[PDB]
Amino acid sequence: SMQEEDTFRELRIFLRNVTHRLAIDKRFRVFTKPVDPDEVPDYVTVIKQPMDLSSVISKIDLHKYLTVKDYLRDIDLICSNALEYNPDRDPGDRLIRHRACALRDTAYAIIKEELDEDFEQLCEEIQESR
Ligand SMILES: CC(=O)c1nc(NC(=O)[C@@H](C)N)sc1-c1cccc(N)c1
């Protein structure tokens, strides 16, 4: 219905705003664009499902997220990919892992503070009805 399309449009506006706030944070610059195989050849051999904040924005605009949980699964994938690709004790690895955990914690904290729980529940119930 039109009432349901209005709900999903509000969800997309909310998700674009969260993603923008993550993408302008200097700590998260390494997560803003797809990893370039020219700059990192070994990446596609370790990471089977790449994800980044620019790809998240594209998926919002393709109506791929109908619930906040679907969105957080891709935020969680950005983080888990970084942890898997950077497992070593070296300072370069530890720095990326710290930033990845901060990206995940920041996204969850914004949603916990700013998303109405009844709004997320409505999105879930519309989705389960389709
Ligand atoms: C996001 C990620 O997993 C990632 N990990 C790196 N690890 C390392 O450089 C070594 C030291 N552990 S670099 C890097 C990355 C990816 C895209 C762009 C830029 N600037 C960095």
Curated annotation (Swiss-Prot):
Induction: Up-regulated in breast, uterus, colon, ovary, and stomach tumors. Induced in breast cancer cells overexpressing NCOA3 or treated with estrogen. Down-regulated in 5-fluorouracil-resistant derivatives of the colon cancer cell line HCT 116. It is found in: Nucleus. Highly expressed in estrogen receptor positive breast tumors and in osteosarcoma tumors. Belongs to the AAA ATPase family. May be a transcriptional coactivator of the nuclear receptor ESR1 required to induce the expression of a subset of estradiol target genes, such as CCND1, MYC and E2F1. May play a role in the recruitment or occupancy of CREBBP at some ESR1 target gene promoters. May be required for histone hyperacetylation. Involved in the estrogen-induced cell proliferation and cell cycle progression of breast cancer cells. Interacts with ESR1 and NCOA3 and these interactions are enhanced by estradiol. Interacts with acetylated lysine residues on histone H1.4, H2A, H2B and H3 (in vitro). This is ATPase family AAA domain-containing protein 2. It comes from Homo sapiens (Human). The gene is ATAD2. The chain holds residues 981 to 1108 of 1390 of the full protein.
